[PDB]
Amino acid sequence: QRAYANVNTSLADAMAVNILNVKDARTNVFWADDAIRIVSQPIPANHELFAGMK
Amino acid sequence: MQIKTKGDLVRAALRKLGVASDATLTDVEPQSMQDAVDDLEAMMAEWYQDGKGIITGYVFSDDENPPAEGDDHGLRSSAVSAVFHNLACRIAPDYALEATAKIIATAKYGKELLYKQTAISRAKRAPYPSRMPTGSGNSFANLNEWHYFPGE
Amino acid sequence: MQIKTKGDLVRAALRKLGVASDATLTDVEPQSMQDAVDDLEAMMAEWYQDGKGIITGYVFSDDENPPAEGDDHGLRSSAVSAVFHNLACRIAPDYALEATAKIIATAKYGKELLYKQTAISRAKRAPYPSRMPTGSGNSFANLNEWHYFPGE
Amino acid sequence: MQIKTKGDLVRAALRKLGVASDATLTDVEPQSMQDAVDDLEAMMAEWYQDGKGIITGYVFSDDENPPAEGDDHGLRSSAVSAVFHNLACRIAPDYALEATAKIIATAKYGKELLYKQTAISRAKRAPYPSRMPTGSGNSFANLNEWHYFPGE
Amino acid sequence: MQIKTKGDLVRAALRKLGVASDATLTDVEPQSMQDAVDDLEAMMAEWYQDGKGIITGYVFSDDENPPAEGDDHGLRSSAVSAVFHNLACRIAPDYALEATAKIIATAKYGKELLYKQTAISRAKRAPYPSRMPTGSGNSFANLNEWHYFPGE
Numbered sequence: 001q002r003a004y005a006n007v008n009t010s011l012a013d014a015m016a017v018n019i020l021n022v023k024d025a026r027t028n029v030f031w032a033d034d035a036i037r038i039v040s041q042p043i044p045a046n047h048e049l050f051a052g053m054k
Numbered sequence: 055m056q057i058k059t060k061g062d063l064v065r066a067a068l069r070k071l072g073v074a075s076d077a078t079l080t081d082v083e084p085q086s087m088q089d090a091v092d093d094l095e096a097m098m099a100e101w102y103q104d105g106k107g108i109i110t111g112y113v114f115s116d117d118e119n120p121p122a123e124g125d126d127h128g129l130r131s132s133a134v135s136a137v138f139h140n141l142a143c144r145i146a147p148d149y150a151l152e153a154t155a156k157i158i159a160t161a162k163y164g165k166e167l168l169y170k171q172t173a174i175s176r177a178k179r180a181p182y183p184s185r186m187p188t189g190s191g192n193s194f195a196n197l198n199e200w201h202y203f204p205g206e
Numbered sequence: 207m208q209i210k211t212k213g214d215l216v217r218a219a220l221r222k223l224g225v226a227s228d229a230t231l232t233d234v235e236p237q238s239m240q241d242a243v244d245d246l247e248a249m250m251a252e253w254y255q256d257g258k259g260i261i262t263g264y265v266f267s268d269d270e271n272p273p274a275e276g277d278d279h280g281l282r283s284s285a286v287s288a289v290f291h292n293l294a295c296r297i298a299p300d301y302a303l304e305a306t307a308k309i310i311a312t313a314k315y316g317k318e319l320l321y322k323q324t325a326i327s328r329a330k331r332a333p334y335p336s337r338m339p340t341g342s343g344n345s346f347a348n349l350n351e352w353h354y355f356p357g358e
Numbered sequence: 359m360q361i362k363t364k365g366d367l368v369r370a371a372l373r374k375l376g377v378a379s380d381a382t383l384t385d386v387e388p389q390s391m392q393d394a395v396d397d398l399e400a401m402m403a404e405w406y407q408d409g410k411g412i413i414t415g416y417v418f419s420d421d422e423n424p425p426a427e428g429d430d431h432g433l434r435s436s437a438v439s440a441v442f443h444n445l446a447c448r449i450a451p452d453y454a455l456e457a458t459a460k461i462i463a464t465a466k467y468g469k470e471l472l473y474k475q476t477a478i479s480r481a482k483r484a485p486y487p488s489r490m491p492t493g494s495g496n497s498f499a500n501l502n503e504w505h506y507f508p509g510e
Numbered sequence: 511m512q513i514k515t516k517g518d519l520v521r522a523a524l525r526k527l528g529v530a531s532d533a534t535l536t537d538v539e540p541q542s543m544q545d546a547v548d549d550l551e552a553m554m555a556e557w558y559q560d561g562k563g564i565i566t567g568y569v570f571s572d573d574e575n576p577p578a579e580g581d582d583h584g585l586r587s588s589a590v591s592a593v594f595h596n597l598a599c600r601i602a603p604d605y606a607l608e609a610t611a612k613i614i615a616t617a618k619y620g621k622e623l624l625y626k627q628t629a630i631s632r633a634k635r636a637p638y639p640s641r642m643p644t645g646s647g648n649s650f651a652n653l654n655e656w657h658y659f660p661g662e
Contacts, residue, residue, distance in 0.1 A: 044196035055251070056244050056274070066248075069241060072302050077237035085380040089373060092360045096370075096442075099359065099435035100471060114359075114435070122360065131266070132255050135248035147374050147458045148381045154299050167252060389533035393525060396512050403511065403587040407623065411588075418587075426512075451610045454528045 136164025288316020440468025592620020
C-alpha cells in the first residue's frame, strides 16, 4: 500500500485548510489527454428509447 | 377489528381455550396475562427469524414503554386468527390443558396461510449462469448487447 | 333469505352447536354473541386474504360503527350455510364442545362450493411466450407485422 | 424482550411444565431454581460443542461469579423460545413428570429453527481439485501459466 | 460449570432419577454413593476401551489415594450431560426404577455427540497401495526414481 503514497504527511488533528480560490475567475484548464474520457454507446434499439420507433 | 393489542390476542386465546372470557365468573391474574404476552413475544420472535422467516408486520415492544400489553400488534386483518390460535396452542400447557383438535387444525391452516404469500414472493428463479452466451438473436438488436451473461 | 345479519349467522351457528336454540330452552347470552361475532370477523378476514383468497361479498365492519352485531353480512344466498356451519365449528371450543361430524362435513362441502366458482375463474392459461413465432398462417399477425408473440 | 436472564428462562420452563407459575398458586423454590440452572448450563454446553455445534450467543458463566442465576443469557430473541422449551423438556424428569406433546413438538421445532441458519452457512462447496486444468478460456491464467487449480 | 467431581456426577444422576437432590428430605447413604461412583468408573472404563473406545478426558482415580469420589473427572464442559445421563440410566436398576423416555433419549443423543468428533478424526483414508505407479505426471518424483507408491 505504501507504494501508492502521494503526500508526505497525513491529516493530523488541528490542521488548517486553505481555499485556493478566493475570487471569481474564469478557469483555464490543462490536462493529460487520457485523463478525461467520454464513455460512449448508442442507445439500445430495444430500450425504453427506440422500442417503438424507426 | 376488535382485536388490536397483544392482550386482545391473549384474551382471545384464553377464550378459545375456555380458561377465561368476558362472560366468565373467574378470571386469570395479570401476572399470568403478562406471562402469556411474553410467550406471544417469544413465538413471534421465533417465527420472524430476524427477517428471514414469516413476515406479518408484528411490532416488538421495547423496554422503554413499560407495558408490552397495550401496544398495537401491527398485524393485518388476515393474521389475527392464526396468531391467537397458535398462541392458545402454545399457552395451553400453562393451565394443565391441551388444545383441542379443531384449535390445532385451525392453527396449522393459519400458519400455512400466513406463509403462503411470502413463499410466493420468495419463489424466484436465479439469473443466468456466468458462462452462458446471450445468443445471436440478441446481437442484431442493441448493437452493443453483451456476448455473455453476467451471473451472480 | 331470512339470515340477513351477522346476528342471524351467529344464532344459526349457536343452534347448530346446540348452545342457544329454541329446540332447547336456552336464550342467547349477550356475551355469547360478541365473541361469536369476533370469531366470524377473524375467520372472514382469514379467508378473504386481502382479495387473494375466497371472495364472498362479506362486508367488514369499521371502527366507526359501535355495534358490530346488527350489520348486513352482505353474503350471497349460496354462502350462508357454509358461513354459519364453519362459524359453529370455529366457536365450538369456547364451550368445551366439539362440532359433530355432520357439521364438519357440511362445513367442508360449503367451503368447497364457496371456492368452486373462484377456482373456475382463476383457471386461466398464460399467454404465449415471447420467443414463439406467430407462423405464416396468422393473417392478423402478418397484417400487423408481428412475427413473434409479445408474451408478458 | 422480557426474558433476559437465566432465571427468566428457568421461570418460563417451570411455568410451561406447570410446576410453579401464577396459573397455579405455586411459587418457584430456590432449590428448584439452582438445579434447573445447572441443567440449562449443561444442556447449552452440550449443544455448543466448543463452536462445532449449535451457535446461540449464549454466555457461559465463569466460576468467578458466585450466583449463576441472574446473569444475562445473551441469546437472541429468536432462540429464547427454543431454549426454554428444551429446558422444560430436559428438567421434566426431575419431578417425575412428563412434558406434554405440544411442549415436545415445540422443542423439536425450535431446535431445528436454531440450527437452520448455521446449516445454511455451513453448506459450502469444496474448492476445485488440485488436478483440474484451469481451461484455456481463462486467458489470464493461461498466460500466467496457472494451468492447474491449487486444491485443498 | 458446577459438576466438577465424580461425586457431583453421581449427585446429578440421582437428581435426574428423582431419588436424591438438595431439596429432598431423605438422602441415599454414602455407601450407595460410593457404589454409584464405582459404577460410573466401570462405565467409563468400558467406554474407553484402553484407548480404542470413546475419548473424553476422563481420569481414572488410583487406589493409592483412598477416596475415588472427590477427584475431578476431567471431562470437558460438553460431555458432563451425556456422562451423568448415562450414569442415571445405568444405576436406575439398583433402586427398582427404570429411566424415563426423556432420560434414555438424552443418553443416546449424548453418547452420539461424544463419539462424533472421534469418528470424524478416525475417518481416515488408507495410503496408495504398494503397487500403484506414481505416474509420469509427477516429474519431480520421476527424476528421483520414485516410480511406485511405498504403501503401508
